Each structure stands twice: as structure tokens, then as C-alpha cells.
Amino acid sequence: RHGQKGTIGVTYRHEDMPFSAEGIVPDLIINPHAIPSRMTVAHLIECLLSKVGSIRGYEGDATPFTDLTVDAVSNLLRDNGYQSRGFEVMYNGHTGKKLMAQVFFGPTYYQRLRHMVDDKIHARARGPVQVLTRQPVEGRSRDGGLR
Amino acid sequence: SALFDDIFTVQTVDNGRYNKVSRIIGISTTNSAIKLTLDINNEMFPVSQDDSLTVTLANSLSLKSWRPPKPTDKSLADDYDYVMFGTVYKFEEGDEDKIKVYVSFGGLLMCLEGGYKSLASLKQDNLYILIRR
């Protein structure tokens, strides 16, 4: 919900994903490089607030221009036995060894967009042509050619 | 066998930016005007100020693919606590008797200042440094 669009690059099975000490594997891994240039801090704040809410069984209130601060959410998260900033010690799926860097980890609301690759893939060797110009027709639905 | 040998007293130990790497500066006890600036691994060979180190430089450990050393074989490194291997990338034939040798042990740098007579034999491609304490 913060303009962070992307496409699936590869799918790993349950046993190939990194896991935390309590066995939680992520559903989805995004690159750290998406954050600094675009400055979507709201993404990180939403992840932290959602983590606290799912731990405590509440729904976070992310209304803008309120008195919510990151430190209050961090205190709540620390009181529940997690690192206050949301980091987690995470293990490597392939070898089982600990990762040297801790991983920001939590639930976030994602939405699936209408643009799927199977509705865009198109190839043409030969096919219908226009009557006037005898050049390939236009359109993926009509088995057309590329300009 | 050994191309240089001396005993150094550590003047300064600088951790600075890093956690596992320390800069140590030492001067030879038997001969001043010989300086040693060196990078070491703290976790394997920790040092403190005013320590005494026996530093030896050799061009070979004898008495191309690397292999884990068999327990049966013996080499020059059996007498020391910290052995590194590096390449000499600068041999500054400086002033009348000011010679500087720069050696890089895979990014961990060493500079050895001294007279020509002491460091004449250190004009090699690769050097082992053997440190005892």
C-alpha cells in the first residue's frame, strides 16, 4: 500500500527459505534496496505495527496526523519478548547456519494486481495480415506482430 | 632460512573502525629507527600495549595448491603463535639509509622502516611473517 510494486522472481519451497528460531518462514522476500531511494518509511512502520497487533490480537490504528510514535510501538513490541525494532535472528535454509545480519521481519498487507504474465506473453512467426498494406495485424488477441 | 629477526615493543594499539583488526606500532629494542606498523587479527592473536613481540620474516616455511597441513609434517611455523603470508608491493629505496617495505597480507597491511643493511634481503615477491609472544 505504499507504491512498492514488483514481480515474482523465483519461488522457493518451505525448506529453502530462511527461518527464525521458532520456525517461521516468510511468504515473501523483498530487497532492502527498495527502501532508501524511495523513502517509504510508512512501509516499515506498518510492518512493525502489524507485528505488534498480530502478537497481541488487536488492529493497529494507522490514521494519519495522530499521536502515534515509533517509540510507543517499539515499547509494546519489546514487552512481548521481541526485539523492539523488529529485527530477528534468522537461519539459512540451505545449510542451517545463522545469518550474520539480522532480518527485518513481520506481516504486511500485500495486494495482487491485475497484470499477470500469462496475459501479456505473445509470440508470432507468421499469421494474418492487413488487407490494405499486407503487414502483420495489430494486437496480441489477433495474433498480431510487433512494431 | 629466516630473512629478518628482531624483538619489538608495542607502542600503540589502534582498533578504530574495525572490530577484528588492530593496528600496532612497534620499535625494535636492539635498534631504534626500525619501525613496524602492522594489521593483526584481534580474535586470534590479541595484543596489549607495551607487549614484547618476536617478529621474524621468512621467504619459505620449509626446514602449488594449498592443502591442510598434515599433523606428521613439521615446518618453521611450529615455533610461533601467529603466521601470515603476503606479497611485497613496494620496496622504497629511499634516502641514505631509510628503506620502507610495504607488505599486504590479503588486505592486512604492514610497513617496515629500517636501515638498508637490515632490510637488504627483504627484496622478495612474497614474505611470511612469524610472530611469537
Binding site: 523465483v10 522457493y12 525448506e15 529453502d16 540451505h94 545449510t95 500469462d118 506473453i121 | 595448491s65 592443502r67 591442510p68 598434515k70
Partner: protein, 113 residues
């Protein structure tokens, strides 16, 4: 549409050998082993078992691509030992370790049942 069948991760075609061994002539007494329909589960186990043998001087493996289920392993032993014998010794040793682990777990489970 272009998604491969999931059983191709572990079901071996008839014409594809499970285990192809080719020597590596760049260094003495080295072989390259190509495992088909295998992944990190067997590879890491074998690699870390072989790394402890005093007569094995180089062992490594890599998975070329996550979308293909195979890995290739490089093994290189001392002059006395043929690498394939070292691989067999590693397999047998891990089997014995697993056997004693199973026996001990069964004993403990019966005690704490």
C-alpha cells in the same frame, strides 16, 4: 503455461543417469560428480562429512540454478586414496551415524513415553 511438472524435481527419467562421474585433469586425483534430482539436503550432508576426512584435500558443491534439480560436486583426495572410495566411506559413515541416532531416539522415547 510454461510451468514444469512438480514431480520432475525427484522423478528420474530412464535415459538420465542418477550419478555421472568425470575426472578433473587440471589437478591430480580429482573427480567431478554430477547428481541428478538432488539438492542441498544430500549435498551439504556429504560435503560436511567429507570435509573432516584427513585424506580429502578439497570438497565442494554447487547448485547451478534453483529451477533445475541437480548439483555438481568436486572431490580431490590424497595420492594414496581414490576419491570414489572416500565418497563411499562418507556415505557409510553417515548411514551408521543415522542408525545410532535412530536407536537412541527410540530408547529415549520409550523411556519418556
Amino acid at each position: 503455461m510454461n510451468a514444469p511438472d512438480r514431480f520432475e524435481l525427484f522423478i528420474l527419467p530412464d535415459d538420465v543417469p542418477k550419478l555421472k562421474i568425470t575426472p578433473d585433469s587440471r589437478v591430480p586425483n580429482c573427480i567431478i560428480i554430477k547428481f541428478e534430482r538432488e539438492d542441498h539436503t544430500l549435498a551439504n550432508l556429504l560435503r560436511e562429512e567429507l570435509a573432516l576426512y584427513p585424506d580429502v584435500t578439497f570438497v565442494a558443491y554447487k547448485v547451478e540454478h534453483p529451477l533445475f534439480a541437480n548439483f555438481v560436486m568436486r572431490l580431490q583426495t590424497e595420492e594414496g586414496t581414490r576419491p570414489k572410495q572416500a565418497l563411499e566411506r562418507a556415505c557409510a559413515s553417515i548411514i551408521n551415524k543415522l542408525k545410532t541416532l535412530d536407536h537412541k531416539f527410540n530408547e529415549e522415547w520409550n523411556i519418556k513415553n
